[PDB]
Every structure is written in structure tokens, then in C-alpha cells.
Design a protein around this ligand. Structure first.
Ligand SMILES: O=C1C(O)=C(O)CN1Cc1ccc(Cl)cc1
Length: 134
């Protein structure tokens, strides 16, 4: 049903801003921040029926999530948090909320021009990560 069509594909990270500070706010430790911050992941997004799959492949970690919009799931993040996640579409933006230990962070993924822009927010700290088609 052409849900998420403009997101589907293989995307490569081309810029990052404020990611170390976002990771600090989330609680990521020093060594993981350094290695994770170096990574240039590819994000691979696909849809099969109602199921969306987002894979992230990098030299740091490979991650994979599959989900149905609005339906909570378990996620182990790249930094090894065990979180409860819900992903919805809000006005054409994929909004990914992660909950763990009474904390919450939100990752928004949006298409803007030929890029896919990822905004990661923890309390007052935002990181913006820009991906281009691979
Ligand atoms: O899901 C994404 C995505 O498509 C990014 O660019 C950043 N991110 C969150 C994130 C948090 C912590 C670590 Cl260690 C690694 C990634």
C-alpha cells in the first residue's frame, strides 16, 4: 500500500552533527561513543506487506529491526540498550520512540530532497545525521 515508498532503498551516511553529545545524553560510554561515532553506516529500508525492515550495516555493528507501524516491539540497540520501541508515521515522518529504564529517546527519519535525514533527540540534545542514496 505504498507505505513508506520514498524511504525504501539503500542509504549511506554522509554527515553527522552533535552525535557524540546525543550519545552522551543517552548514556553511551566513552569507548562505544568513539567507535560508534567513527562508523559510516548504510541504512537499508524495505517493506513487505505491513512489515517494515530497517537494517543498519557498519564496521561497528550490524542491526536489524522489523516492525508494523504502531505496534510495540523489542529492540537491542547498537550500544546494547534493551529498549521497547514503537514506530509510527506522522505526517510523512517515521517517528521511532525507544523506552528503557524510565528514559525515552526519539529518532525521526524524513525524506528531504534526495536525502534521508535522521534526527535523534534525547532531552534537549539533538543530533542530525544525513544519508544519501548508495
Ligand atoms: O538509528 C539511527 C540511525 O539511522 C542513525 O543515524 C543514528 N541512529 C541511532 C543510534 C544510536 C546509538 C548508536 Cl551507538 C547508534 C545509532
Amino acid at each position: 500500500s505504498h507505505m513508506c515508498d520514498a524511504f525504501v532503498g539503500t542509504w549511506k551516511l554522509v554527515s553527522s552533527e552533535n552525535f557524540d553529545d546525543y550519545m552522551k545524553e543517552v548514556g553511551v560510554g566513552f569507548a562505544t561513543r568513539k567507535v560508534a561515532g567513527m562508523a559510516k553506516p548504510n541504512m537499508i529500508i524495505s517493506v513487505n506487506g505491513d512489515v517494515i525492515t530497517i537494517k543498519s550495516e557498519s564496521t561497528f555493528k550490524n542491526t536489524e529491526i522489523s516492525f508494523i507501524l504502531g505496534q510495540e516491539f523489542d529492540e537491542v540497540t547498537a550500544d546494547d540498550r534493551k529498549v521497547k520501541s514503537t514506530i509510527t508515521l506522522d505526517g510523512g515522518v517515521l517517528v521511532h520512540v525507544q523506552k528503557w529504564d524510565g528514559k525515552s529517546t526519539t529518532i525521526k527519519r524524513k525524506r528531504e530532497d534526495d536525502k534521508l535525514v535522521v534526527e535523534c533527540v534525547m532531552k534537549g540534545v539533538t543530533s542530525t545525521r544525513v544519508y544519501e542514496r548508495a
